[PDB]
Protein backbone atom coordinates (compact mmCIF):
# COMPACT_ATOMS: atom_id res chain seq x y z
CA UNK A 1 0.00 0.00 0.00
CA UNK A 2 1.18 3.67 -0.62
CA UNK A 3 2.19 5.80 2.26
CA UNK A 4 -0.47 8.87 2.54
CA UNK A 5 -0.39 11.79 4.76
CA UNK A 6 -3.16 11.54 7.37
CA UNK A 7 -5.76 14.45 5.61
CA UNK A 8 -7.19 16.48 8.06
CA UNK A 9 -6.69 19.70 10.81
CA UNK A 10 -7.30 20.75 13.96
CA UNK A 11 -8.55 24.28 13.22
CA UNK A 12 -7.80 27.08 14.85
CA UNK A 13 -6.96 27.34 18.66
CA UNK A 14 -10.22 27.28 21.06
CA UNK A 15 -12.66 28.02 17.82
CA UNK A 16 -11.65 25.25 15.51
CA UNK A 17 -12.34 22.77 18.12
CA UNK A 18 -15.90 24.29 19.25
CA UNK A 19 -17.02 24.45 16.24
CA UNK A 20 -16.37 20.63 15.84
CA UNK A 21 -17.95 20.06 18.82
CA UNK A 22 -21.19 21.83 17.83
CA UNK A 23 -20.96 19.63 14.71
CA UNK A 24 -20.45 16.35 16.44
CA UNK A 25 -23.45 16.97 18.92
CA UNK A 26 -26.02 19.64 17.40
CA UNK A 27 -25.20 20.61 13.37
CA UNK A 28 -24.40 16.92 12.21
CA UNK A 29 -24.67 13.93 14.94
CA UNK A 30 -21.81 11.70 15.34
CA UNK A 31 -22.54 9.26 12.61
CA UNK A 32 -22.43 12.66 9.90
CA UNK A 33 -19.55 14.12 11.57
CA UNK A 34 -17.67 11.35 10.58
CA UNK A 35 -18.87 10.39 7.11
CA UNK A 36 -18.87 14.14 5.89
CA UNK A 37 -14.95 14.32 6.62
CA UNK A 38 -14.62 10.49 5.44
CA UNK A 39 -16.07 12.34 1.98
CA UNK A 40 -14.19 15.46 2.36
CA UNK A 41 -10.58 14.02 2.85
CA UNK A 42 -11.90 11.00 0.93
CA UNK A 43 -10.11 9.05 3.75
CA UNK A 44 -11.54 6.77 6.29
CA UNK A 45 -8.17 8.07 8.06
CA UNK A 46 -7.79 11.71 9.21
CA UNK A 47 -7.50 13.80 12.23
CA UNK A 48 -10.04 15.54 13.93
CA UNK A 49 -10.77 17.76 16.91
CA UNK A 50 -13.15 15.49 18.94
CA UNK A 51 -15.34 16.70 22.50
CA UNK A 52 -15.24 18.03 24.89
CA UNK A 53 -12.18 20.43 24.77
CA UNK A 54 -12.70 23.27 26.49
CA UNK A 55 -11.61 23.19 30.57
CA UNK A 56 -12.65 19.27 30.51
CA UNK A 57 -10.06 17.76 28.42
CA UNK A 58 -6.30 18.76 27.94
CA UNK A 59 -5.88 18.08 24.13
CA UNK A 60 -8.89 17.46 21.79
CA UNK A 61 -6.92 16.54 18.65
CA UNK A 62 -6.95 12.46 17.52
CA UNK A 63 -6.17 10.23 14.71
CA UNK A 64 -9.92 8.68 13.40
CA UNK A 65 -9.69 5.51 12.14
CA UNK A 66 -13.44 4.64 10.35
CA UNK A 67 -12.76 1.59 8.89
CA UNK A 68 -12.54 -2.35 9.44
CA UNK A 69 -8.68 -2.59 8.53
CA UNK A 70 -7.35 -0.23 10.43
CA UNK A 71 -9.47 0.08 13.53
CA UNK A 72 -8.29 -3.20 15.30
CA UNK A 73 -4.96 -1.76 15.84
CA UNK A 74 -7.12 -0.31 19.09
CA UNK A 75 -6.95 -3.78 20.36
CA UNK A 76 -3.30 -4.25 20.27
CA UNK A 77 -1.91 -3.63 23.44
CA UNK A 78 1.49 -3.49 21.65
CA UNK A 79 0.82 -1.13 20.07
CA UNK A 80 -1.24 1.00 22.55
CA UNK A 81 -1.44 1.90 25.81
CA UNK A 82 -4.69 1.68 27.22
CA UNK A 83 -4.38 3.95 30.41
CA UNK A 84 -6.95 6.55 31.58
CA UNK A 85 -8.14 6.60 28.51
CA UNK A 86 -11.87 4.66 29.05
CA UNK A 87 -13.77 7.79 28.12
CA UNK A 88 -11.61 9.44 25.66
CA UNK A 89 -8.97 12.62 25.84
CA UNK A 90 -10.36 13.15 29.52
CA UNK A 91 -10.62 10.73 32.40
CA UNK A 92 -13.54 11.51 35.32
CA UNK A 93 -11.98 12.31 38.93
CA UNK A 94 -11.16 9.51 40.85
CA UNK A 95 -13.51 11.65 43.29
CA UNK A 96 -16.24 10.23 41.81
CA UNK A 97 -14.94 6.65 42.19
CA UNK A 98 -13.71 6.23 46.13
CA UNK A 99 -10.25 7.74 45.35
CA UNK A 100 -9.56 4.35 43.08
CA UNK A 101 -8.51 4.64 39.30
CA UNK A 102 -10.77 1.76 38.36
CA UNK A 103 -9.79 -1.37 36.24
CA UNK A 104 -11.50 0.15 33.11
CA UNK A 105 -8.64 2.79 33.46
CA UNK A 106 -5.98 0.95 33.90
CA UNK A 107 -3.38 -0.57 31.31
CA UNK A 108 -2.26 -4.28 31.29
CA UNK A 109 1.25 -3.78 32.02
CA UNK A 110 -0.46 -2.30 35.74
CA UNK A 111 -0.32 -5.17 38.15
CA UNK A 112 -4.02 -4.50 39.59
CA UNK A 113 -5.75 -4.82 36.10
CA UNK A 114 -4.67 -8.73 36.19
CA UNK A 115 -6.35 -8.92 39.58
CA UNK A 116 -9.44 -7.12 39.28
CA UNK A 117 -9.91 -8.61 35.96
CA UNK A 118 -9.72 -11.81 37.32
CA UNK A 119 -12.33 -10.94 40.26
CA UNK A 120 -14.73 -9.79 37.62
CA UNK A 121 -14.18 -13.35 36.38
CA UNK A 122 -14.51 -14.90 39.12
CA UNK A 123 -17.80 -13.00 40.00
CA UNK A 124 -19.17 -14.02 36.24
CA UNK A 125 -18.46 -17.39 36.94
CA UNK A 126 -19.80 -17.76 40.49
CA UNK A 127 -23.28 -16.54 39.18
CA UNK A 128 -23.49 -19.44 36.30
CA UNK A 129 -26.48 -21.03 37.97
CA UNK A 130 -28.41 -17.94 39.03
CA UNK A 131 -28.68 -16.50 35.67
CA UNK A 132 -30.91 -18.21 34.00
CA UNK A 133 -33.80 -18.22 36.80
CA UNK A 134 -32.81 -14.74 37.70
CA UNK A 135 -33.75 -13.19 34.29
CA UNK A 136 -36.83 -15.07 33.76
CA UNK A 137 -38.14 -14.21 36.77
CA UNK A 138 -36.90 -10.07 36.73
CA UNK A 139 -37.90 -9.79 33.47
CA UNK A 140 -41.21 -11.63 33.29
CA UNK A 141 -42.48 -8.83 35.81
CA UNK A 142 -40.93 -6.32 33.91
CA UNK A 143 -43.28 -7.84 30.50
CA UNK A 144 -45.93 -7.95 32.71
CA UNK A 145 -45.62 -4.22 33.90
CA UNK A 146 -45.39 -3.88 30.14
CA UNK A 147 -49.01 -5.25 29.52
CA UNK A 148 -50.37 -3.40 32.39
CA UNK A 149 -48.92 0.25 31.20
CA UNK A 150 -49.97 -0.50 27.45
CA UNK A 151 -53.33 -1.30 28.63
CA UNK A 152 -53.91 1.47 30.38
CA UNK A 153 -52.13 4.21 28.25
CA UNK A 154 -52.31 2.32 24.81
CA UNK A 155 -48.02 2.67 25.01
CA UNK A 156 -45.94 1.03 27.55
CA UNK A 157 -42.46 3.05 27.91
CA UNK A 158 -39.89 0.33 27.91
CA UNK A 159 -36.68 2.63 29.40
CA UNK A 160 -38.20 3.81 32.43
CA UNK A 161 -39.38 0.31 34.10
CA UNK A 162 -36.53 -2.08 32.31
CA UNK A 163 -34.04 0.02 33.92
CA UNK A 164 -35.03 -1.39 37.44
CA UNK A 165 -35.45 -4.81 36.34
CA UNK A 166 -31.87 -4.64 34.72
CA UNK A 167 -30.72 -3.30 38.46
CA UNK A 168 -33.09 -6.22 40.19
CA UNK A 169 -31.59 -8.65 38.00
CA UNK A 170 -28.21 -7.96 38.56
CA UNK A 171 -28.28 -7.99 42.41
CA UNK A 172 -30.07 -10.74 42.58
CA UNK A 173 -27.75 -12.63 39.48
CA UNK A 174 -24.64 -11.50 41.09
CA UNK A 175 -25.49 -11.14 44.85
CA UNK A 176 -28.28 -12.94 45.77
CA UNK A 177 -30.12 -9.88 46.98
CA UNK A 178 -33.17 -8.38 46.03
CA UNK A 179 -32.34 -4.69 46.40
CA UNK A 180 -36.17 -4.46 47.40
CA UNK A 181 -34.76 -6.38 50.60
CA UNK A 182 -32.50 -3.17 51.16
CA UNK A 183 -31.95 0.39 52.26
CA UNK A 184 -31.51 0.73 48.06
CA UNK A 185 -35.09 -0.01 47.63
CA UNK A 186 -36.63 0.91 43.95
CA UNK A 187 -33.81 3.97 43.88
CA UNK A 188 -30.78 2.21 42.36
CA UNK A 189 -31.61 3.42 38.53
CA UNK A 190 -31.99 7.28 39.92
CA UNK A 191 -28.61 7.07 42.07
CA UNK A 192 -26.41 5.39 39.21
CA UNK A 193 -27.96 7.81 36.60
CA UNK A 194 -27.20 10.26 38.21
CA UNK A 195 -23.66 9.67 38.85
CA UNK A 196 -23.52 8.00 35.19
CA UNK A 197 -24.32 11.73 34.53
CA UNK A 198 -21.33 13.27 36.55
CA UNK A 199 -19.13 10.75 34.97
CA UNK A 200 -20.03 10.73 31.15
CA UNK A 201 -21.63 14.98 31.28
CA UNK A 202 -18.68 15.78 28.42
CA UNK A 203 -19.43 13.19 26.11
CA UNK A 204 -23.75 13.30 25.73
CA UNK A 205 -26.43 15.63 24.59
CA UNK A 206 -29.42 15.71 26.95
CA UNK A 207 -31.33 17.52 24.55
CA UNK A 208 -31.52 20.91 25.93
CA UNK A 209 -30.63 24.09 23.68
CA UNK A 210 -26.92 24.48 23.11
CA UNK A 211 -26.87 27.86 24.62
CA UNK A 212 -27.78 26.06 27.85
CA UNK A 213 -26.03 22.59 27.22
CA UNK A 214 -22.88 24.05 26.28
CA UNK A 215 -22.14 26.02 29.48
CA UNK A 216 -23.35 23.79 31.67
CA UNK A 217 -22.62 20.19 30.67
CA UNK A 218 -19.80 20.59 27.90
CA UNK A 219 -17.19 23.60 28.89
CA UNK A 220 -16.62 22.47 32.92
CA UNK A 221 -16.76 19.09 35.30
CA UNK A 222 -19.60 19.02 37.15
CA UNK A 223 -18.58 18.56 40.78
CA UNK A 224 -18.06 15.32 42.20
CA UNK A 225 -19.11 16.46 45.62
CA UNK A 226 -22.91 16.78 44.40
CA UNK A 227 -23.05 13.03 43.67
CA UNK A 228 -21.26 11.58 46.89
CA UNK A 229 -23.97 10.69 49.29
CA UNK A 230 -25.68 8.86 46.30
CA UNK A 231 -22.45 7.31 45.60
CA UNK A 232 -22.21 6.28 49.35
CA UNK A 233 -25.75 4.41 49.29
CA UNK A 234 -24.70 2.55 46.10
CA UNK A 235 -20.94 1.41 47.75
CA UNK A 236 -22.82 0.43 51.04
CA UNK A 237 -25.04 -1.70 49.02
CA UNK A 238 -22.28 -2.95 47.55
CA UNK A 239 -20.77 -3.33 50.43
CA UNK A 240 -22.98 -5.42 52.64
CA UNK A 241 -24.48 -7.54 49.72
CA UNK A 242 -20.91 -8.88 47.62
CA UNK A 243 -19.55 -11.11 50.72
CA UNK A 244 -18.89 -13.89 48.62
CA UNK A 245 -17.23 -12.39 46.00
CA UNK A 246 -15.37 -10.18 48.50
CA UNK A 247 -13.92 -13.31 50.20
CA UNK A 248 -12.25 -14.07 46.11
CA UNK A 249 -11.09 -10.18 46.23
CA UNK A 250 -9.27 -11.15 49.54
CA UNK A 251 -7.92 -14.67 47.92
CA UNK A 252 -6.91 -12.70 44.87
CA UNK A 253 -4.88 -9.88 46.84
CA UNK A 254 -7.51 -7.11 46.65
CA UNK A 255 -8.34 -5.04 49.48
CA UNK A 256 -11.91 -4.88 50.42
CA UNK A 257 -12.59 -1.33 49.89
CA UNK A 258 -11.29 -1.28 46.31
CA UNK A 259 -13.06 -4.72 45.84
CA UNK A 260 -16.12 -2.59 46.64
CA UNK A 261 -15.50 0.32 44.43
CA UNK A 262 -14.38 -1.69 41.39
CA UNK A 263 -17.85 -4.18 41.54
CA UNK A 264 -19.77 -1.08 42.02
CA UNK A 265 -18.56 0.04 39.04
CA UNK A 266 -18.57 -3.51 37.13
CA UNK A 267 -21.91 -3.29 37.93
CA UNK A 268 -23.48 0.05 37.62
CA UNK A 269 -21.26 1.29 34.91
CA UNK A 270 -20.08 -1.26 32.51
CA UNK A 271 -23.42 -3.43 32.92
CA UNK A 272 -26.30 -1.41 34.37
CA UNK A 273 -24.96 0.85 32.36
CA UNK A 274 -24.33 -0.72 28.61
CA UNK A 275 -27.41 -2.75 29.34
CA UNK A 276 -28.94 0.31 29.44
CA UNK A 277 -27.99 1.15 26.12
CA UNK A 278 -28.22 -2.15 24.70
CA UNK A 279 -31.49 -3.28 25.53
CA UNK A 280 -33.63 -0.48 24.31
CA UNK A 281 -31.51 -0.82 20.88
CA UNK A 282 -32.28 -3.90 20.23
CA UNK A 283 -35.50 -3.64 21.07
CA UNK A 284 -35.71 -1.18 18.37
CA UNK A 285 -33.95 -2.58 15.53
CA UNK A 286 -36.04 -5.86 16.04
CA UNK A 287 -39.12 -3.95 15.95
CA UNK A 288 -38.42 -2.67 13.22
CA UNK A 289 -37.24 -6.06 11.21
CA UNK A 290 -41.05 -6.54 10.97
CA UNK A 291 -43.93 -9.37 12.38
CA UNK A 292 -42.39 -11.67 9.69
CA UNK A 293 -39.16 -11.81 11.35
CA UNK A 294 -40.77 -11.84 14.90
CA UNK A 295 -42.95 -15.01 14.08
CA UNK A 296 -39.58 -16.84 12.84
CA UNK A 297 -38.02 -16.29 15.76
CA UNK A 298 -40.72 -16.90 18.43
CA UNK A 299 -41.45 -20.40 16.22
CA UNK A 300 -37.29 -21.08 16.63
CA UNK A 301 -37.64 -20.31 19.89
CA UNK A 302 -40.74 -21.90 20.97
CA UNK A 303 -39.77 -25.12 19.12
CA UNK A 304 -36.08 -25.56 20.81
CA UNK A 305 -37.50 -25.00 23.79
CA UNK A 306 -40.12 -27.66 23.34
CA UNK A 307 -37.35 -30.16 22.15
CA UNK A 308 -35.70 -29.60 25.77
CA UNK A 309 -38.44 -30.33 27.64
CA UNK A 310 -39.49 -27.12 27.80
CA UNK A 311 -36.06 -26.34 30.01
CA UNK A 312 -34.02 -23.34 28.94
CA UNK A 313 -30.26 -24.39 28.66
CA UNK A 314 -27.43 -23.30 27.37
CA UNK A 315 -27.22 -25.86 24.99
CA UNK A 316 -30.70 -25.17 24.25
CA UNK A 317 -29.48 -21.67 23.15
CA UNK A 318 -26.74 -22.85 20.46
CA UNK A 319 -30.07 -24.45 18.69
CA UNK A 320 -31.20 -20.97 18.55
CA UNK A 321 -29.83 -19.90 14.77
CA UNK A 322 -31.80 -17.01 14.33
CA UNK A 323 -31.91 -16.07 17.55
CA UNK A 324 -27.82 -15.88 18.28
CA UNK A 325 -27.41 -14.47 14.32
CA UNK A 326 -30.22 -11.49 15.38
CA UNK A 327 -28.43 -10.31 18.84
CA UNK A 328 -25.03 -10.70 17.05
CA UNK A 329 -26.57 -8.50 13.79
CA UNK A 330 -27.74 -5.80 16.98
CA UNK A 331 -24.10 -5.62 18.42
CA UNK A 332 -22.48 -5.35 14.65
CA UNK A 333 -25.20 -2.76 13.48
CA UNK A 334 -25.45 -0.62 15.98
CA UNK A 335 -22.50 -1.01 18.56
CA UNK A 336 -23.72 0.47 22.24
CA UNK A 337 -20.49 1.78 22.80
CA UNK A 338 -19.01 3.96 19.26
CA UNK A 339 -15.95 5.25 21.10
CA UNK A 340 -12.82 3.19 21.77
CA UNK A 341 -9.66 4.91 22.39
CA UNK A 342 -5.56 4.01 22.38
CA UNK A 343 -2.46 6.37 22.70
CA UNK A 344 0.61 4.93 20.55
CA UNK A 345 3.19 3.09 22.57
CA UNK A 346 6.16 3.42 19.26
CA UNK A 347 5.50 5.22 15.77
CA UNK A 348 2.92 2.81 14.34
CA UNK A 349 1.99 2.12 10.44
CA UNK A 350 -1.41 1.58 10.01
CA UNK A 351 -2.89 -0.08 7.30
CA UNK A 352 -6.07 1.03 5.87
CA UNK A 353 -8.22 -0.59 2.80
CA UNK A 354 -6.60 1.78 0.23
CA UNK A 355 -2.92 3.31 1.83
CA UNK A 356 -1.01 3.02 5.20
CA UNK A 357 -0.47 5.81 7.66
CA UNK A 358 2.21 7.02 9.44
CA UNK A 359 1.59 7.92 13.40
CA UNK A 360 3.93 8.91 16.36
CA UNK A 361 4.35 7.59 19.45
CA UNK A 362 2.05 9.57 21.68
CA UNK A 363 -0.72 10.26 19.44
CA UNK A 364 -4.02 9.52 20.21
CA UNK A 365 -5.84 7.54 18.11
CA UNK A 366 -9.78 7.12 17.92
CA UNK A 367 -12.17 4.39 16.68
CA UNK A 368 -16.26 5.06 15.18
CA UNK A 369 -16.94 1.88 15.73
CA UNK A 370 -20.07 1.73 13.91
CA UNK A 371 -17.75 2.67 10.50
CA UNK A 372 -15.68 -0.14 11.22
CA UNK A 373 -18.34 -2.70 11.50
CA UNK A 374 -20.68 -1.17 8.93
CA UNK A 375 -17.34 -1.12 6.92
CA UNK A 376 -18.97 -2.05 3.01
CA UNK A 377 -15.11 -3.70 1.95
CA UNK A 378 -16.00 -6.27 5.27
CA UNK A 379 -19.75 -6.63 5.09
CA UNK A 380 -22.15 -7.09 2.08
CA UNK A 381 -25.37 -4.99 2.62
CA UNK A 382 -23.63 -3.47 5.15
CA UNK A 383 -26.24 -0.57 6.30
CA UNK A 384 -29.10 -3.30 6.30
CA UNK A 385 -30.36 -5.10 9.47
CA UNK A 386 -30.22 -9.04 8.29
CA UNK A 387 -31.56 -10.98 10.99
CA UNK A 388 -29.65 -14.15 9.73
CA UNK A 389 -26.41 -12.68 8.92
CA UNK A 390 -24.37 -15.07 10.64
CA UNK A 391 -26.41 -18.29 10.52
CA UNK A 392 -24.25 -21.09 9.33
CA UNK A 393 -20.36 -21.97 8.55
CA UNK A 394 -19.55 -19.11 6.21
CA UNK A 395 -21.80 -16.29 8.00
CA UNK A 396 -20.06 -17.13 11.92
CA UNK A 397 -16.89 -16.68 9.88
CA UNK A 398 -17.91 -12.94 10.34
CA UNK A 399 -17.69 -13.11 13.76
CA UNK A 400 -13.95 -11.49 14.13
CA UNK A 401 -15.32 -8.33 12.32
CA UNK A 402 -18.02 -7.67 14.90
CA UNK A 403 -16.17 -5.41 17.63
CA UNK A 404 -18.90 -4.46 20.16
CA UNK A 405 -16.60 -5.73 23.16
CA UNK A 406 -13.18 -4.26 21.85
CA UNK A 407 -12.12 -6.87 20.27
CA UNK A 408 -13.21 -9.21 17.51
CA UNK A 409 -16.32 -11.64 18.50
CA UNK A 410 -14.45 -14.44 18.01
CA UNK A 411 -11.74 -13.82 20.67
CA UNK A 412 -11.74 -14.33 24.41
CA UNK A 413 -10.97 -11.43 27.54
CA UNK A 414 -7.77 -11.91 29.11
CA UNK A 415 -6.22 -10.23 31.58
CA UNK A 416 -3.34 -9.54 28.99
CA UNK A 417 -5.60 -7.51 26.99
CA UNK A 418 -8.38 -4.99 27.29
CA UNK A 419 -11.39 -6.60 25.61
CA UNK A 420 -14.79 -6.23 27.79
CA UNK A 421 -14.47 -8.94 31.25
CA UNK A 422 -18.70 -9.48 30.55
CA UNK A 423 -18.34 -10.50 26.73
CA UNK A 424 -19.91 -14.06 27.12
CA UNK A 425 -22.49 -12.74 29.77
CA UNK A 426 -23.42 -9.61 27.48
CA UNK A 427 -24.25 -12.15 24.58
CA UNK A 428 -25.68 -14.25 27.43
CA UNK A 429 -28.57 -12.02 28.39
CA UNK A 430 -28.93 -9.99 25.21
CA UNK A 431 -29.82 -14.01 24.54
CA UNK A 432 -32.42 -14.55 26.72
CA UNK A 433 -33.59 -10.82 26.65
CA UNK A 434 -35.04 -12.02 22.89
CA UNK A 435 -36.32 -15.41 23.91
CA UNK A 436 -37.83 -13.94 26.69
CA UNK A 437 -39.73 -11.62 24.20
CA UNK A 438 -40.82 -14.09 21.73
CA UNK A 439 -41.76 -16.93 24.31
CA UNK A 440 -43.83 -14.67 25.47
CA UNK A 441 -45.62 -12.90 21.81
CA UNK A 442 -45.89 -13.29 18.41
CA UNK A 443 -44.94 -10.17 17.35
CA UNK A 444 -44.91 -6.37 18.69
CA UNK A 445 -45.10 -2.67 17.42
CA UNK A 446 -43.13 0.00 18.69
CA UNK A 447 -42.55 4.02 18.99
CA UNK A 448 -39.13 5.38 18.95
CA UNK A 449 -37.33 8.51 20.34
CA UNK A 450 -34.01 9.97 21.08
CA UNK A 451 -32.67 9.37 24.15
CA UNK A 452 -28.77 10.80 25.92
CA UNK A 453 -27.52 7.01 25.84
CA UNK A 454 -29.14 5.14 23.28
CA UNK A 455 -32.96 5.14 22.57
CA UNK A 456 -36.39 5.66 23.86
CA UNK A 457 -38.21 3.02 23.23
CA UNK A 458 -42.58 2.63 23.47
CA UNK A 459 -44.17 -0.65 22.94
CA UNK A 460 -47.54 0.19 21.41
CA UNK A 461 -48.48 -3.52 20.81
CA UNK A 462 -47.72 -6.41 22.11
CA UNK A 463 -49.55 -9.55 20.44
CA UNK A 464 -49.16 -12.62 23.40
CA UNK A 465 -48.90 -16.13 22.09
C1 LIG B 1 -24.21 -4.55 27.47
C2 LIG B 1 -23.31 -4.38 28.45
C3 LIG B 1 -21.84 -4.03 28.17
C4 LIG B 1 -21.29 -3.29 27.17
C5 LIG B 1 -22.01 -2.58 26.01
C6 LIG B 1 -19.85 -3.26 27.35
C7 LIG B 1 -18.90 -2.66 26.54
C8 LIG B 1 -17.54 -2.54 26.82
C9 LIG B 1 -16.54 -1.85 26.01
C10 LIG B 1 -16.85 -1.16 24.66
C11 LIG B 1 -15.37 -1.91 26.65
C12 LIG B 1 -14.01 -1.31 26.20
C13 LIG B 1 -13.72 -0.01 26.94
C14 LIG B 1 -12.50 0.67 26.35
O1 LIG B 1 -11.35 0.41 26.80
O2 LIG B 1 -12.70 1.49 25.42
C15 LIG B 1 -15.58 -2.65 27.89
C16 LIG B 1 -14.62 -2.92 28.82
C17 LIG B 1 -14.85 -3.50 30.04
N1 LIG B 1 -16.03 -4.08 30.49
FE1 LIG B 1 -17.72 -4.32 29.35
N2 LIG B 1 -19.58 -3.98 28.50
C18 LIG B 1 -20.75 -4.49 29.02
C19 LIG B 1 -20.88 -5.32 30.11
C20 LIG B 1 -19.92 -5.68 31.03
C21 LIG B 1 -20.03 -6.66 32.10
C22 LIG B 1 -21.23 -7.60 32.33
C23 LIG B 1 -18.88 -6.64 32.79
C24 LIG B 1 -18.53 -7.50 34.03
C25 LIG B 1 -17.30 -7.98 34.17
C26 LIG B 1 -18.03 -5.62 32.18
C27 LIG B 1 -16.78 -5.25 32.58
C28 LIG B 1 -15.86 -4.57 31.80
C29 LIG B 1 -14.54 -4.25 32.23
C30 LIG B 1 -13.95 -4.60 33.61
C31 LIG B 1 -13.86 -3.55 31.10
C32 LIG B 1 -12.39 -3.08 31.09
C33 LIG B 1 -11.60 -4.36 30.74
C34 LIG B 1 -10.13 -4.27 31.06
O3 LIG B 1 -9.75 -3.32 31.77
O4 LIG B 1 -9.35 -5.15 30.60
N3 LIG B 1 -18.68 -5.07 31.08
N4 LIG B 1 -16.91 -3.04 27.96
C1 LIG C 1 -22.88 4.36 31.21
C2 LIG C 1 -21.76 3.80 30.36
C3 LIG C 1 -22.30 2.59 29.64
C4 LIG C 1 -21.27 1.83 28.82
C5 LIG C 1 -20.40 0.96 29.72
C6 LIG C 1 -19.51 0.04 28.90
O1 LIG C 1 -19.11 -1.07 29.73
C7 LIG C 1 -18.26 0.71 28.35
C8 LIG C 1 -17.96 2.01 28.41
C9 LIG C 1 -16.95 2.48 27.66
C10 LIG C 1 -16.55 3.76 27.54
C11 LIG C 1 -17.11 4.92 28.36
C12 LIG C 1 -17.86 5.93 27.52
C13 LIG C 1 -19.26 5.39 27.22
C14 LIG C 1 -20.03 6.34 26.32
C15 LIG C 1 -21.28 5.66 25.76
C16 LIG C 1 -22.14 6.66 24.97
C17 LIG C 1 -21.38 7.35 23.82
C18 LIG C 1 -20.76 6.38 22.82
O2 LIG C 1 -21.43 5.39 22.40
O3 LIG C 1 -19.57 6.61 22.48
C1 LIG D 1 -33.06 15.38 33.01
C2 LIG D 1 -32.02 14.31 33.32
C3 LIG D 1 -31.27 13.90 32.04
C4 LIG D 1 -30.96 12.41 32.04
C5 LIG D 1 -29.45 12.17 32.01
C6 LIG D 1 -29.13 10.72 31.67
C7 LIG D 1 -27.66 10.55 31.31
C8 LIG D 1 -27.17 9.18 31.72
C1 LIG E 1 -27.45 18.94 34.04
C2 LIG E 1 -26.59 18.93 35.28
C3 LIG E 1 -27.41 19.24 36.53
C4 LIG E 1 -26.58 19.10 37.80
C5 LIG E 1 -27.37 18.43 38.91
C6 LIG E 1 -26.87 18.87 40.28
C7 LIG E 1 -27.91 18.60 41.36
C8 LIG E 1 -27.29 17.89 42.55
Not at 76 to 103: A, F
Not at 385 to 403: D, T
Request: aromatic share 12%.
Amino acid sequence: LPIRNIPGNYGLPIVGPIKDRWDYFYDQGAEEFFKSRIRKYNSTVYRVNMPPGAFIAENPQVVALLDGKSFPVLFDVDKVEKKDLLTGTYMPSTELTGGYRILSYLDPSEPKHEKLKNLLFFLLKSSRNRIFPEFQATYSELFDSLEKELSLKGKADFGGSSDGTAFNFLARAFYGTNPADTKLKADAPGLITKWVLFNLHPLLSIGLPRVIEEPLIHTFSLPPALVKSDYQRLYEFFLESAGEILVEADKLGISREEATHNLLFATCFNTWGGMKILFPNMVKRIGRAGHQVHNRLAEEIRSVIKSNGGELTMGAIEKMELTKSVVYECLRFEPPVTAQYGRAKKDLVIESHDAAFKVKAGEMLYGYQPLATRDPKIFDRADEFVPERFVGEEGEKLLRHVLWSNGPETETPTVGNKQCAGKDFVVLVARLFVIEIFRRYDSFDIEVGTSPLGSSVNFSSLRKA
